[PDB]
Structure 1
Amino acid sequence: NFNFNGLTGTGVLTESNKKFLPFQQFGRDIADTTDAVRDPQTLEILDIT
């Protein structure tokens, strides 16, 4: 289970190859569920499969 800045869900968090631009904070699915997220402390990008 995860809770990033209030974004609450469940998944297998994994290091992401997605090249988020410096301003981007989240990534989205076609269903607008969050598909990737930026850690608010380390600023790294994680996949949320």
Structure 2
Amino acid sequence: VLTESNKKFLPFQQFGRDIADTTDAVRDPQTLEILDITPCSFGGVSVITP
């Protein structure tokens, strides 16, 4: 999921690998804006019965 971000990259930097060498922020090559990246959704399903 691409969302807005508040972090400020250096002028020559492109993307971020802060934790575990995983990309989470990518500079837009056109508008020169930084967009956050996050996987959309995943999880389990539980059923409650009496």
TM-score of the two chains, using structure 2 as the length reference: 0.66
* Structure 1 runs (4+) greater than 3 angstroms displaced: none
Query: By percentage of residues, which structure has more strand?
Result: 1
Equivalent pairs: percent with the same residue?
Answer: 100
Unpaired stretches in structure 1, ≥5 consecutive residues: 1-11
Paired residues, what number?
38
Aligned residue in 2 for 1:4: none
Greater radius of gyration (CA): 2
Q: Output the aligned Cα RMSD.
A: 1.0
Alpha-carbon offset, residue 31 of structure 1: 2.0
Unpaired stretches in structure 2, ≥5 consecutive residues: 39-50
TM-score of the two chains, using structure 1 as the length reference: 0.67
